[PDB]
């Protein structure tokens, strides 16, 4: 009966909408992180957070600056994706 | 409780709110940073920024909630001020009225 | 004439007002912008990071045009006895009304009470010269403003001239394209 | 349903409005405190405070 | 026309959303792949790796076709001022709406939204443009796109190449073809 | 304009305003053909 009611090529249809929804959701809740992201920017100064991480990274003895931004088979597989 | 009475309640309150709101801000503000030592410790550096943000965001909300405070209070303090002299004055009449 | 002077006063006071938290708010989200600058040229997005600078060059023309408005706005403010004493408008007011008026279209998603400001403006001075000023026939609307609302793209010097110099702050290696360079 | 009744474009939409309103809410706040500060500018001399 | 320019401007922005999350996703699943190629060739299943590789360099191309239409809606956002100024379409925008126009009906699976920026499109710039762009008579459309989104099977020597290039890196023993490597 | 808010508060993806088989075409083209 229920692999009648709900057969292969129908469960094939479900999960597929189940995969495209959560991508949905997933873009819906970026849109929204980055709306409060901007609507309290001034509360969250870029400079002011990269100084805090400098300042614990040097107590924690951690040799890393944290004001500038921070594999080989996909890059072989790239320049293959040129050459041809 | 007169009118301004009920007014100058209400803004006493909302001074005190706004001072409260600040003193938590200041003290999140001290367990963030907890959190960002114990993340680099741990090299989650995502995590170490995640509550870095946190930690900048509670210092400066503490600072708007507090400089708020100060103007809601001054505010109480002038409706203090015409709580009490609408008060001798009523008194004033009074005296004026009964001597006359 | 539908002219009210406490409408405009009042609507003046706003404008600087929002035009000032405006500016502090986009100069912030400017800084944020640079360095998703720097990780696309720090993975080598050299092509999308042109297009990305774009953005940030609107951003920080219209910055310096939101300034340009806030003084002209003052200025009306400042001499606002002569708004409201004369029927003519003062030599030392033409360029801040014409240009408030041509601005109040364009910027009137950001401001709304910018609007406002040059209704009353064109009702104080008439609805033709009103339309000479958004047109710019009256020849008086201030060129630095204009330049920085201009709807057209920058020179692809000066897309190269910021990336170059973004490319410096966040110690990250970019070569710029020798064509555009070349006409520098 | 959910995805229907809310979809990405009024969320958008929703999203730029509350931004936008809470711009007009800071501009309010600052001309609530200007007028404090005028108000009692007597009680705080500025030459008293440096 | 139906033409409505912030309709234009939501989507576009959704648009850019939706294909930085597919790039992520698809790029992670690759990595996956990858690892079953491996693992067909660790137990001599050669003859269908080289099937199972054809599934993956259509992958790799649809993110890099991906990462260019971004790029295009993003250059549309930073110039909208030009659009939504003129009734012509302008030199630098030509590129980037006859190339939305033409890929909207291959990607309309997997980004929804892209539709609905070409249907906007095809309402500014007139149907018979529309048709136009989509068989590529206007001669415009990104010649990099179309051969990203080809429905033709890959060089067997990139198939070959891209197996060679697997079978190092999990340390697989591999022996490619000699007549489709000798082709080269 | 009644229609079009109530389809836009149901994420309906329609217009109001505007006006809104194979087999009688195909047979409408022989009709015209002979």
Aim: charged content about 30%; aromatic content about 4%; some cysteine.
């Amino acid at each position: 009966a229920t692999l009648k009611t709900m057969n292969l090529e129908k469960i094939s249809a479900l999960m597929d909408k189940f995969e495209h929804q959560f991508e949905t959701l997933d873009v819906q809740t970026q849109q929204m992180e980055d709306t409060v992201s901007s609507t309290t920017t001034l509360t969250t100064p870029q400079n002011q957070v990269d100084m805090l991480l400098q300042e614990m990274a040097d107590e924690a003895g951690l040799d890393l600056n944290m004001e500038l931004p921070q594999d080989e088979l996909s890059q072989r597989l790239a320049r293959l994706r040129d050459q041809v | 409780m007169s009118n301004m009475e009920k007014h100058l309640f209400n803004l006493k309150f909302a001074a005190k709110e706004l001072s409260r709101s600040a003193k938590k801000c200041d003290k999140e503000e001290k367990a963030e940073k907890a959190k960002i030592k114990k993340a680099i410790q741990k090299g989650n550096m995502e995590v170490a920024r995640i509550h870095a943000e946190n930690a900048i965001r509670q210092k400066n909300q503490a600072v708007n909630f507090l400089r708020m405070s100060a103007r809601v209070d001054a505010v109480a303090a002038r409706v203090q001020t015409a709580v009490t002299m609408g008060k001798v004055t009523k008194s004033m009449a009074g005296v004026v009225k009964s001597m006359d | 004439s539908g002219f009210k002077a406490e409408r405009l006063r009042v609507n003046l006071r706003l404008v600087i007002n929002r035009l000032k938290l405006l500016e502090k708010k986009k100069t912030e989200l400017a800084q944020k912008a640079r360095k998703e600058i720097a990780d696309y040229l720090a993975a080598g997005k050299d092509e999308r990071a042109r297009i990305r600078v774009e953005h940030i060059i609107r951003e920080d023309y219209l910055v310096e045009a939101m300034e340009i408005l806030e003084l002209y706005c003052d200025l009306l403010l400042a001499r606002f006895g002569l708004i409201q004493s004369m029927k003519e408008l003062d030599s030392g007011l033409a360029e801040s009304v014409s240009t408030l008026i041509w601005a109040a279209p364009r910027l009137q998603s950001e401001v709304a009470e910018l609007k406002i400001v040059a209704d009353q403006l064109c009702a104080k001075y008439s609805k033709e010269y009103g339309k000479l000023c958004r047109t710019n026939q009256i020849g008086t609307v201030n060129d630095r403003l204009m330049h920085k609302l201009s709807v057209e793209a920058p020179p692809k010097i000066l897309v190269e001239r910021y990336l170059i110099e973004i490319a410096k702050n966040y110690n990250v290696p970019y070569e710029p394209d020798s064509v555009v360079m070349a006409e520098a």
